[PDB]
């Protein structure tokens, strides 16, 4: 007896926004784009962990 | 001679003179640079469009 099975690829994503003046002023804790990127990466990693 | 001469003609000898090539002569004018809309926008928004 034999069988054949299939699996379907799915899609995940998120979006991040930063206004233009925010990138011109001084910052207390470093560049903001990198911080937003890190936050998004960690958030999506947690979502992947729970979706698994 | 008890009348005028060509020395008394003033304005005809002072107005600039240019050549013409037709009975109708056209020229272009620039009347304005834009409408009197608001110039202040709020944070990261797209400003309105203006035309001359």
């Amino acid at each position: 007896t034999y069988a054949r099975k299939a699996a379907f690829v799915k899609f995940l994503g998120t979006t991040r926004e930063v206004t233009h003046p925010m990138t011109l002023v001084n910052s207390a804790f470093g560049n903001v784009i990198a911080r937003q990127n890190k936050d998004g990466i960690l958030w999506m990693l947690k979502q992947i962990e729970q979706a698994l | 001679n008890l009348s005028f001469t060509d020395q008394h003609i003033k304005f005809w000898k002072k107005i600039p003179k240019q050549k013409a090539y037709s009975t109708v002569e056209q020229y272009g004018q620039l009347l304005d640079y834009g409408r009197s809309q608001g110039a202040f926008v709020g944070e990261g928004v797209l400003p309105d469009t203006n035309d001359s």
Side-chain angles (χ1 to χ4, degrees):
Chain A
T1 307
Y2 305 96
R4 179 163 280 176
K5 310 283 203 210
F8 303 144
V9 169
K10 310 288 197 177
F11 317 98
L12 295 97
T14 197
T15 317
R16 289 269 157 170
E17 301 185 353
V18 163
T19 58
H20 180 240
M22 187 66 204
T23 67
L24 284 167
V25 311
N26 262 356
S27 179
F29 323 115
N31 185 284
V32 288
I33 303 290
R35 185 80 256 169
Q36 300 297 309
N37 259 319
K38 290 171 190 169
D39 300 359
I41 281 168
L42 269 169
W43 185 86
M44 184 177 177
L45 278 170
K46 188 243 198 183
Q47 307 310 313
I48 288 168
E49 182 65 26
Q50 284 179 350
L52 277 182
Chain B
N1 194 330
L2 313 186
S3 196
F4 64 90
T5 70
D6 63 358
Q7 295 297 109
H8 303 108
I9 289 280
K10 296 307 184 33
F11 185 17
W12 178 241
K13 269 192 263 299
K14 190 222 289 203
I15 180 167
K17 288 171 190 63
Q18 308 174 337
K19 212 198 160 203
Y21 311 97
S22 184
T23 56
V24 181
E25 298 263 333
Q26 294 168 43
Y27 56 104
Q29 300 191 320
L30 178 43
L31 271 63
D32 189 358
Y33 287 126
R35 288 189 291 273
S36 288
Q37 309 163 158
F40 290 98
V41 306
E43 198 73 20
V45 299
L46 179 76
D48 279 11
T49 70
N50 221 322
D51 63 358
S52 308

